[PDB]
Design a protein around this ligand. Structure first.
Ligand SMILES: [Mg+2]
Ligand SMILES: [Mg+2]
Ligand SMILES: [Mg+2]
Ligand SMILES: [Mg+2]
Ligand SMILES: [Mg+2]
Ligand SMILES: [Mg+2]
Ligand SMILES: [Mg+2]
Ligand SMILES: [Mg+2]
Ligand SMILES: [Mg+2]
Ligand SMILES: [Mg+2]
Ligand SMILES: [Mg+2]
Lengths: 272, 136, 77
RNA sequence: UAAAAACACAGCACUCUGCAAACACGAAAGUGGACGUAUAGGGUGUGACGCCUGCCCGGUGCCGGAAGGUUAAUUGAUGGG
RNA sequence: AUGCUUGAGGUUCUAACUCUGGUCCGUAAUCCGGAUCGAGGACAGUGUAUGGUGGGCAGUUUGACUGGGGCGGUCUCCUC
């Protein structure tokens, strides 16, 4: 489902698109939609605070059910949809009581599949259960950190985590970052991989496609004047002239920035 | 912080001794819950005016503790909740809902010190090694 | 604001002075912490924002005498 | 008075970031990042594509280590008044 | 050495403290506060004191002579 475009024009050369024909061709589920107005990555104060954000497409937010807390009641997937809010696909579960919900679609999940969450959920790659009921060695996604807070960890397209160890009240997961982390065994997770794993194979072909996604251009620091950037200045084209730093002076080649002593006990082994 | 005790504590409890403790031991544990009281040069004066009527009560509550701890030391009360395995159930096998299980066959047995990190604790010198069996 | 509810301690100003005696305006803030104080006569926990000196005053005077002063001072807890 | 060979760009790479994320604006509360969660987000450099990208870690930076040396507030032995 | 004043690491516990976790209430409410459960936990965090780092930012300095200035030389003392 990776399609390379023919070079019928400049800007179409090097366009590689993910075209999923199994996605829903109609409208999303209206009761689960919600207004989502854009910021230009701008603050409470009206200040930017996050550069390169602006001018994408209008998007409805989809109310994705991250706390799959309808334990016991089975569901039918019955649809997989496109979500503009995330790189993963979403599936519209229809529960046995008729309630409809949106969840992150797992890898092999198609319309008509049966998903269930709870303690006694069968071990198949769409189901959700607390991490203590997940056998060691399973591949999981959408892992809670706080019981009841909802899925937080493995959520983007193709994301997954590996359950490597299980102590008393904690479970050790291997994140796709390579970090070994401790998670409460009471926290819920969904078995399997997240869908749309081929999303990384796509290539935008042109400057416009990045603008379609709401990303404004990045200007290099060496292209500026010294008043704007630490890398600015120089007659002719020059390098940074100093150890590379952010526009606010923080070194950006190495120079670890993690300063969270509160959560340090949850990190077994650290990788990024 | 000089305080005098009301109940006896495990390490330094003489029930009325002049005990010097860290300010955080009181003000956060003893005074709020009630296990001691600051010596204000008159609380010690009023402690003797109440010690005679309180230590007899302290024994009486202690006496009822062993009586209740030994009366219900032979129960094999079993829950009727749905379970998946003997130790791995669909619910939670912990000291969160067993109050009605033991209350239906004797004393209410309010759960405040039923330790399970089934030795139920009820006083400093009184403790019972109750054994719970669950069918699954 | 950064004012102790018991003692009325608030931010005060002053100078940072370097070894070369360059003076920089600075502030001195009270050691304010949030603390819940048990009130037996109300059977309630009262959460106050006090300096560490204000907590010592409550140790010396009691929460009841301190809270009565708080009521007479007007501002409520 | 400069439209360019400048800037951007798709693509590339390095690095940071486990979520109360890094980072940014804010004495702060809070807010953006993001109602996103490492196929994500930030910063840096390079600049479609094709063939490639060699040697140097001495200097400076960054990362890791902690045996030794040195080293703050603090404490106050001892001596001298 | 039974026992005794008190330093420094580690491990537990909960009761301070924290939660941008659940539930209930104020309440017609994603704020807030209270209750409660859960999770951390004397850590984190904040005040104050202190060492490091710190062009991110600030205030400034960066001589004179001189066949223009700069570069070079010279700048005080002794002898011709
Ligand atoms: Mg870029
Ligand atoms: Mg650029
Ligand atoms: Mg320029
Ligand atoms: Mg600058
Ligand atoms: Mg040049
Ligand atoms: Mg022109
Ligand atoms: Mg360039
Ligand atoms: Mg500290
Ligand atoms: Mg300057
Ligand atoms: Mg001036
Ligand atoms: Mg001159």
């Amino acid at each position: 489902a990776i399609v390379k475009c023919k070079p019928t024009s400049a800007g179409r050369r090097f366009v590689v698109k993910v075209v999923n024909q199994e996605l829903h061709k109609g409208a999303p589920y209206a009761p689960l939609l919600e207004k989502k107005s854009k910021s230009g990555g701008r603050n409470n104060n009206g200040r930017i605070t996050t550069r390169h954000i602006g001018g994408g497409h209008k998007q409805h937010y989809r109310l994705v059910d991250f706390r799959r807390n309808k334990d016991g009641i089975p569901a039918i997937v019955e649809r997989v949809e496109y979500d503009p809010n995330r790189t993963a696909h979403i599936a519209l579960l229809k529960y046995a009581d008729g309630e409809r919900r949106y969840i992150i679609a797992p890898k092999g999940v198609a319309a008509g599949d049966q998903l269930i969450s709870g303690i006694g959920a069968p071990i198949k790659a769409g189901n959700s259960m607390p991490l203590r009921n997940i056998p060691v060695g399973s591949t999981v996604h959408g892992i809670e950190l706080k019981p009841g807070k909802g899925a937080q960890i493995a959520r983007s397209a193709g994301a997954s985590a590996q359950l490597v160890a299980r102590e008393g009240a904690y479970v050790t997961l291997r994140l796709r970052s390579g970090e070994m982390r401790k998670v409460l065994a009471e926290c819920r997770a969904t078995l399997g991989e997240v869908s749309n794993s081929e999303h990384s194979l796509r290539s935008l072909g042109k400057a416009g496609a990045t603008r379609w996604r709401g990303v404004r251009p990045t200007v290099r620091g060496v292209a500026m004047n010294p008043v704007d950037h630490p890398h600015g200045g120089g007659e002719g084209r020059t390098s940074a002239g100093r150890h590379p730093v952010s526009p606010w002076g923080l070194q950006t080649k190495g120079k670890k920035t993690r300063s969270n002593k509160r959560t340090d006990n949850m990190i077994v082994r650290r990788r990024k | 912080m000089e305080v005098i005790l009301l109940e006896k504590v495990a390490n330094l409890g003489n029930l009325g001794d002049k005990v010097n403790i860290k300010g955080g031991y009181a003000r956060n544990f003893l005074l709020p819950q009630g296990k001691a009281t600051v010596a204000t040069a008159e609380n010690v004066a009023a402690f003797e005016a109440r010690r005679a009527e309180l230590e007899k009560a302290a024994a009486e509550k202690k006496a009822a503790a062993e009586a209740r701890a030994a009366q219900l030391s032979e129960l094999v009360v079993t829950l009727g909740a749905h379970a998946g395995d003997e130790g791995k159930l669909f619910g939670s096998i912990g000291t969160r809902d067993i109050a009605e299980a033991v209350s239906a066959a004797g004393y209410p047995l309010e759960k405040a010190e039923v330790r399970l990190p089934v030795a139920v604790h009820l006083h400093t010198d009184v403790e019972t090694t109750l054994k719970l069996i669950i069918v699954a | 604001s950064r004012v102790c509810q018991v003692t009325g301690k608030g931010p005060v100003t002053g100078n940072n002075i370097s070894h070369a005696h360059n003076k920089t305006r600075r502030r001195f803030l009270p050691n304010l912490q949030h603390h819940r104080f048990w009130v037996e006569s109300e059977k309630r926990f009262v959460r106050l924002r006090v300096s560490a000196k204000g907590m010592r005053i409550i140790d010396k005077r009691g929460i009841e005498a301190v809270l009565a002063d708080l009521r007479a001072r007007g501002e409520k807890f």
